[model samples]
Target: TCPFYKKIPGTGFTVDAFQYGVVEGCTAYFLTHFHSDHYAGLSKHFTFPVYCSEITGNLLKNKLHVQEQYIHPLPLDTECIVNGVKVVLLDANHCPGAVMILFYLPNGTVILHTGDFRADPSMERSLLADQKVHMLYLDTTYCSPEYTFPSQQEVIRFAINTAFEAVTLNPHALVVCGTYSIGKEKVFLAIADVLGSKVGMSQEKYKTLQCLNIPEINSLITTDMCSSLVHLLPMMQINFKGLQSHLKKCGGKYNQILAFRPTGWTVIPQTKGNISIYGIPYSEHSSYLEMKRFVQWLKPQKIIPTVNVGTWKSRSTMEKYFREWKLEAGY
Candidate 1:
């Protein structure tokens, strides 16, 4: 919603404007991912073929039911020419099939569009470092310094440990976990592997995991939840009504239900618990410090924050201010 669209001059390529925008005389479209926010009005109207990662293409076809002819799959790090300009897809490390795009114009202007990515070292080296990045479209989800959360690993570890601990402590309670329908399959698999248990899910979620063909993960799906049973429920279904109506009726046929929500809000350290749910700091995006370091490393001449930047400053001023932001602290 923060104006994610960008128009490349000389060529008529539009970046991530699926919602309700189209650069006039646009020749092609590049989608960073399959998230609806990135593709708001795509379903309603589209003329040119949409380009994205393979998994994203599949999602567009399978999940959204877009026609296969309209979807194009781009491989990571591979050069593909569109509208007479050099384009490459790089791993975004945000979700499966999400990618950052690099466009090299005819006039030697290289632009980097970080399509909702985290700070992945491999991506930083492959796409950011030692490159002539003229324009940087930053995904500043955690632009503010109050978002000095630890790396995703720290949060992930805490979540898995707490889930395991909860099950160990309350072996009779149902360990219910919540996640996006398609995201964070790894988390469920990791917790299952450590706890030596199968993750219970609905028919669609189980089929989706099996369709992805991760045998190690696919084998972890189940419906029969019992003592210490780890249930993988939808992110939307982790609420009081959903929990009480759906999970409580299904898993809570006899026993009590203990819930865990893996998200970015509670990034301090420990998990906060109530009678029905536990908030765990598990995020899929890069932290504020990570984003800062990444921008400083890329060293773009001009930064175009994906979200609101508040006000526009001269390139030199903003650059200097951003350099100090990573380590500068305040109360």
Candidate 2:
């Protein structure tokens, strides 16, 4: 059981769960993304049919390996009715399966819930031109004025430049980095796009990329596309002997090798001579600029701040900040 509903200080509705509670009488539940914070409670507690995009459903069932009784999958820009509530899914462009949910009620009230999203002008244009949203439920995780993130393109450019610099500086070196499998596809695409060359991939890495449904970027080539570029293969565990053997087979053919892993690169010893490791800053969540742009687009009629008891302090701080911003915006 979860906490009971408590009155939100300003809004008509009451929020009880950590962004995932079932309303006592509401007929449907709308999910924005598959992130833990957004859909954690759905697995064990609620058996009701949850709404999400087709990609999200695939990721949950295949990638996360979850078993749920009911999953209502919708494609991008399609509207569906569940038990009487109208719901629509929009492209969030944050993660591989991320989405924004639009809840339309019979009373003419529309609530736009933006799961974690980044500032992509292309994405922003899609949302703004779509419709005039009424109540906006935003992601304020990094809403502070001081917080800022470089554009996705800029981040991609940096990653490619770094890779190129490394390859040029040391012909025999290997570069490794870390990123979330679902969130960092764009970064890889950017690298591939800039390079406009193919990189080798192990059978396993190729399969993993296929599972993620990453599009082939014109900039960079994959193992399937080209055989000359260096490919750093994924390993269950860091085995120097195994890597060395693998590298030895193709050592002279490629100038440099680059590999990607979740986070083990830090502890793994650089046993292979002339290898260097770097951490590239790539994330899917919105930066401060994107957050501001999101707010400006929503122009919410009422900002009902979410209050998670476990994170009361942070939520309270966010509420205060939004209150001030609303006042300044003449709301």
Candidate 3:
């Protein structure tokens, strides 16, 4: 039912590169972030110069292992001309290395592409100052009134408090908080700083930390240093029964485990021995209200709904909600 990619009606420019074949004649590709959803197709299909922030460039080079030749890293807020198109990068507070792009045309037309961002009022106040936006491509992941998100500081406190409680309740227990191999290292560092004891990480995780050049935490320990505390990766679907069996065989004596992921407790059935699950909902994506606020601030003339086709149905529902909100606001 959908064409390979949807062009802007009569305009030859496609809305997304992934949908089409990354057509050979495209002028330029504006990358919103290094996330797979946004830039995965760029490496294989889109050979044109891609514009993004320096942090995004580092992320692509260090985190994603993407080639440097294809990237055109620009500083945030600084405008650059690529094939006669003016491009500017803006901070996207979703990950350590993420950005939103602003494309300005010579005809006074502006297009804002928000890759994937979370709205922290503090971040908004600091990062976004004076801007005039014409059109916006937003991240409508949680564009509903019912959804509420906690503050980032609150999330950090939750993680710290949970770890302390786990350790205090059982002095002999090995407390380990699971997170992404790269980004959530800071969370673990916070846990270590609070607990005043070394926390354990997998060997792979240690290498990742080393690559990031994170200073040693008083309470940080790698699997090679402390084999007893290493647990399976969080947020992944693995053979839990086998994991539990292996832990039992190894005399798993830990009283508590701390893990942070989108799906924290859904996979607890597969873990072993006196395990307690804690849901510290710390997420990187923006909330519904934040998304709404961002759109309102931009005050774009038009909006383009862009998302993976797999999520198109849900996105369509959200689009309708946004349209009603816009009308109510007298936009």
* TM-score for each model: 0.83, 0.71, 0.76
List candidate 1 segments past 4 Å from native.
Answer: 1-5, 207-215, 222-228, 251-254, 266-275, 309-331
**Reference-based lDDT, each prediction:** 0.69, 0.56, 0.58
Predicted structure 2: lDDT: 0.56
Arrange candidates by lDDT, highest first: which order?
1, 3, 2
Clashing residue pair totals per candidate (backbone < 3 A)? 0, 7, 5
Model 2 regions more than 4 Å off: 1-29, 36-48, 64-69, 120-124, 127-132, 169-171, 193-208, 211-213, 216-273, 305-309
RMSD of each: 4.5, 6.0, 4.5
Task: Please write out the lDDT profile of model 2 over residues 309-328, one tens digit for every residue.
Answer: 34778677766766766676
TM-score of 1: 0.83
Clashing pairs in 2: 192-219, 192-220, 193-219, 193-220, 196-219, 197-221, 198-221
lDDT of 1 by residue, 193-261 (tens): 677788887766665555453556546777555532677777888777766665456534524556777
Best candidate (score: TM-score): 1
Kindly give the stretch of ten consecutive residues in candidate 2 with the minimal lDDT sum.
7-16
lDDT of 2 at 279: 42
Residue 19's C-alpha lDDT in candidate 3? Answer: 40
| TM accuracy, model 3 | 0.76
